[PDB]
Every structure is written in C-alpha cells, then in structure tokens.
Amino acid sequence: EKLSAEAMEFFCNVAKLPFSQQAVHFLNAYWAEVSKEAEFIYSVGWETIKYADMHCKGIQLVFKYDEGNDLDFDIALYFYEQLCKFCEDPKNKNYATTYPISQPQMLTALKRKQELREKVDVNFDGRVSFLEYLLYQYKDFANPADFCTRSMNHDEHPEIKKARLALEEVNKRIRAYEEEKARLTEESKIPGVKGLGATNMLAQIDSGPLKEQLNFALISAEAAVRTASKKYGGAAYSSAGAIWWMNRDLEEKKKRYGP
C-alpha cells in the first residue's frame, strides 16, 4: 500500500525525529501487538542503531552523542550486521530465545542492500530510520500505511512531553558531569602544579556541583514520569509505549547515576 501524500509527510516527519521518539511512535501504535518485544527494541535495537550512527559521526563516548535519525545504506549495513552478530553470540542467547519475532536475518551485503531498497526504505530517500527498521522487522503485523493510520492525529500529551524533556535534561546533566570528569582526568596526567588539583577534584567529584545538579535532575525526571504515568498508564499507576519507554529509561538512568 503506497501512502497518500498526507501519510507520507507524517511518516517522513516521524522518521526524522530522534531514534527514541521514532521508537515511541512505533510502540504507542503497536503496543497491543508488540509490547513483549519492547525490551529488545530498547536494549538491542536502539543501542545498536545508536552505535552505528555514532561511528558514522566519529563519536566514541555516549555522553557526547546527540541522538540521530537515519542511516545511509552503507551505515545501515553495519547496523544490521552488528544486530546479527549480537543476537548470534551465545552470551546473548537469552535475547534470542526470549524474543524470536525480533530476531534479525543474516544476509550478504548484496542481498541486504537489495532488501533496503525493495522493502525497508519506504520513503525512497536512500536512508534507513529506526522507524523503517521496526516496521520491516515486525512486518507480520506492522506496515507503513497501517502505522500512519494508527499514529496520525495522536499528539503527544503535555504531561508526557514534560516527562520526556525532563529525561532529556538528565542527559544534559550527565554530559556536563562526564565532561568535567574527563576534563579533570586528562589534567590529572599533568605532573605538578597542577596537575594535582585535578586529582583531588576528580576524587571529590561526586560531592561537587555537577553531580549535585544531576542528582536533582534525576528527581525531577522521576516526578515528571510518575505524574505522566499516573495520568495515562492505567492501573499499575495509546500512550502505553511512551509510558513504558520513559520508565525504562528512568530506571536505566537511576541505576547508572543515582545514589
């Protein structure tokens, strides 16, 4: 089913959003069908497309990465290859047995580009978005026209937007904190005077301002996620994917940078 101009414009806009927002559009639309793969989408699909994008952009450290949206076909190829390698590694056999419908398919380079071109790249821009990867991965029930029908005219609720942006503000505080850590680290290797101030600062860093600001940003995020979840996540507390993603992400953040 070719898309109307109106649906294509929608699709193209979603597909230029940061990957995580593409993911949430997908998850909201298909929550009834796909909720049990959410964890794979989050932990494996997202991480992998992000790493492929980082390399493309010559970024090594996650805290310096501004999240991307789509990949050219050569970079997509590295994405799908990395997916297959991850899932084929016995160290991750849990992911493979627990999420069969999420498993990628190994293909030669040639067959891969032919699938991108024939099937995955639905707006014909020579780019692969996370959205496009998702739709094709879950094609037993998902497809672009269906997706647009499901997702069009469902605007992000303001409580949800607040909570998403509060989470993005945690990212900003994490970057500020990790950049300063790394600043100090690299001065740490200045023998003398100093050189030496750097060391104590580094040693003291988690009682410093930037760590303080991160700790408080984590509380704000959490409060905002809660009020959004209470309002839209049903008991336990359409927007279900956004609710699940934000809680997952908060969880990850707290684990890594909380008390």
Chain residues in the site for Ca ion (CB under 5 A): 121, 123, 125, 127
Closest by CA to 205, choosing from 223, 188, 190, is 188
Site string for a copy of itself, 106-125 (x = CB under 8 A): ---xx--xx--x-----xxx
Q: How many residues bind a copy of itself (CB under 8 A)?
A: 27
Minimum CB separation from a copy of itself for residue 27, in Å?
Answer: 23
User: Which does residue 16 touch among a copy of itself, Ca ion, none (CB within 5 to 8 A, set by kind)?
Assistant: a copy of itself
Minimum CB separation from Ca ion for residue 70, in Å?
Answer: 6
Binding of residue 126 to a copy of itself (CB under 8 A): yes
| Single-letter amino acid code for the residue at 127 | R
Nearer to Ca ion, 55 or 248 (CB): 55
| Single-letter amino acid code for the residue at 229 | S
Closest by CA to 42, choosing from 221, 250, 258, 235, is 250
| Single-letter amino acid code for the residue at 69 | N
User: Which does residue 5 touch among Ca ion, a copy of itself, none (CB within 5 to 8 A, set by kind)?
Assistant: a copy of itself
Binding of residue 251 to a copy of itself (CB under 8 A): no
Minimum CB separation from Ca ion for residue 132, in Å?
Answer: 5
Binding of residue 198 to a copy of itself (CB under 8 A): no
Binding of residue 17 to a copy of itself (CB under 8 A): no
Nearer to a copy of itself, 51 or 237 (CB): 51
Residues 6+ apart with CB under 8 A from 119: 136
Binding of residue 161 to a copy of itself (CB under 8 A): no
Residue with tokens 């990395």: 82
User: Which does residue 217 touch among Ca ion, a copy of itself, none (CB within 5 to 8 A, set by kind)?
Assistant: none
Nearer to a copy of itself, 74 or 212 (CB): 74
Residue with tokens 């760590």: 211
Could you give the C-alpha distances from 165 to 6, 24, 161, 212, 249, in angstroms and in order? 28, 14, 6, 19, 12
Helix (H, G, I), strand (E, B) or coil at 129: strand
Binding of residue 56 to a copy of itself (CB under 8 A): yes
User: Which does residue 77 touch among a copy of itself, Ca ion, none (CB within 5 to 8 A, set by kind)?
Assistant: a copy of itself
C-beta of residue 128 within 8 angstroms of C-beta of residue 79: yes
Nearer to a copy of itself, 60 or 207 (CB): 60
C-beta of residue 52 within 8 angstroms of C-beta of residue 71: yes
Helix (H, G, I), strand (E, B) or coil at 178: helix
DSSP symbols for 38-89: HHHIIIIIHHHHHHHHHHHTT---GGGPPP--EEEHHHHHHHHHHHHHHHHS
Residues that bind a copy of itself (CB under 8 A): 5, 8-9, 12, 16, 52, 55-58, 60-61, 72-75, 77-78, 109-110, 113-114, 117, 123-126
